[model samples]
Target: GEPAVTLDPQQSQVFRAWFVRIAQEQLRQGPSPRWHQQDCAGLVRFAANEALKVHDGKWLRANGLSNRYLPPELALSPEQRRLAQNWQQGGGQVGPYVNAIKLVQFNSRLVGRDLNQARPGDLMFYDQGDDQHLMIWMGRSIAYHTGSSTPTDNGMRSVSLQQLMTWKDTRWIPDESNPNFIGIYRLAFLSQ
Candidate 1:
């Protein structure tokens, strides 16, 4: 059967805004301890889960969110909400710990290779042989965890798309010519 969850236009806008904002916050203030597994796929999972949550005072304080007003609700049906909760707790369709490749393959749908086709909350995947990396598109900038080899080397980064295009590691660039770039993808729950 087709996926039952689908966000309306307004809900999608709210979700995208919140997703990007949450990801950007990690870059500014460091990842919240609530977000365990501070890696690239973890960042995406954390932001997406938080975006769908009820943004009340308790949730705000728990997450260290500064916004006074709540983001608009997603109006999820009971069944849809259940699915979301399972994903949030890391136990449902995607599982407790999804890798970069598994994330795109199972939880998201391909958007395209063109950078212009991307929107906020979309993902960019790169397959560098055995290593895979993911980044969240934040309109003008992209946010990601370095997924560093050593604990000391790991950290979050938010860099502009323009600067990323000129990255020293050409294979990481999101160009059509770069086969290593698997292209952009959007969460399956989001409507087309």
Candidate 2:
């Protein structure tokens, strides 16, 4: 496993700037689920690995896990993991992203529930009784791909946290029937 990395104020500022810029590009490109194979996890992989250059100088796919809590492509043996890590180090290939739910299920540590404390690149997971979802917190607002069958909800959408709490929450899990805010997590790999 990889040790966690901390971000100082200066590093945090740089990471935030890069995240915001790349997020705009990803959000604008919208949810091309089939083409990009972009689920919630895949998008964040780009943020951490490509844009911010986190992941312990290695991409998430190469993070190497003995546990099978990963998408098909990410589950690799120690030997396979080593080879993939080397290839990635030399910029061999790029595609596929993390499965956010698996990390929430296994890897991440809690960072509290307060919206004000949430930073630009924080991961927020939601479970609406039926299923789970992931989104990125952009401080005052959140940007996410709905993964909805409805065309309108397929792409990325940003809404204020307050609106998100009340309106979106109510719409998904009325009267707190099923929707769960889950918890926020600052990726262990975030750093300069």
Candidate 3:
């Protein structure tokens, strides 16, 4: 079981407002493009850091945030959409790895954790093959992840909460159904 941290009335407000804003921004702009990828994960980390300013000491980096190496032409025109036909497998870790670690970097106090131990605001990494994707838990079976499904992108999605007593996304992890899984990363912990 996770020890819940009661947020100050104001912190609670900021909490909801910040995440809501992130989700809204993602919904309005849609997911980001592949190849033309932005350190979106990094941006998320930055946002989380800002959100924590009123709370924690600093930003909490995910347990492990591997640096990304893109060709100098990554942001160049045509170069991004250049290889329109090329394809590759992605690891669910990509999204979190890119973002969470930055948070961890900023706040060495924060550490990576398992999904089972995750609480609201904890970052959850999915195994997408090779750092393919990532998301943040919004409590009650809901998680906010950036990126897309069609062409694979960077959008914020509110995964609906599943009623274990009723129906669920059988493909989900930390559950018994088709358990193709790795683990979850807890973004915060009690200040010991």
Candidate 4:
């Protein structure tokens, strides 16, 4: 499973985990499915947890109820529901990347890191002045992610480096107009 770019165990493990979730979601539903009407984030969560172990589907099985509903109405625990409402918590009604960053922040492991030097498996966050997006790097020129609601599709893909280049903000080229360079975060884990 060598990528075009080599990665360490943690990075490779995370990359595999992302792909496993991507593959499962692709199977259970189809590409993306809509976020507001599907527990797409929840699906990603379940998939990621599942990927960490063997018999992943069984070990990390989310309740059928949990995966059955959509974003705003998904069958979430009270805490999860609350977290889902707070975009800063990574469940905003705004964009997917922000949500993922929120989750990364929630994980608490990735606090301050240099994303420009990020290796595979690093989490990338995109802030478009108004909203944020998140993706996990795989290796070389690919990573997995679901775009924001402005586009309204929640599928996953490992895109080209150039494809991601659109994230660079025009105004924030030399230095950020604010913390608004589009690249706002680079974390190793979310809820640390």
Give the best candidate by lDDT: 1
User: Once superposed on the true structure, which residue ranges of model 2 sit more than 4 Å away at CA?
Assistant: 1-9, 30-36, 53-96, 149-154, 165-179
TM-score to native of every candidate shown: 0.83, 0.60, 0.42, 0.43
Q: Pairing residues by index, what is the TM-score of model 1?
A: 0.83
Tens-place lDDT digits, model 4, residues 62-155: 3232343221212323333233233334443333223344555653253233445555444455455565455554445544445422233445
* Rank order (by lDDT, best first): 1, 2, 4, 3
Model 4 misplaced stretches (Cα beyond 4 Å): 1-44, 56-98, 108-116, 144-154, 166-192
lDDT of 4 at 91: 40
At residue 129, candidate 3 shows an lDDT of: 49
Candidate 3 RMSD to the correct structure? 14.9
Give each prediction's root-mean-square deviation over alpha carbons.
3.6, 11.6, 14.9, 11.7
Tens digit per residue, CA lDDT, model 2, 1-192: 963334455655656655654565565453444323356665665554434343332444443223333222222234322321221212334223336665564434567666567678777777767777777887777877766524433366777756765763364321223347676776644432
Residues 29-80, candidate 3, lDDT per residue (tens digit)?
3334321334435434544433433222221232111243211111212322
Candidate 3 colliding pairs, count:
24
lDDT value, residue 70 of candidate 4 = 21
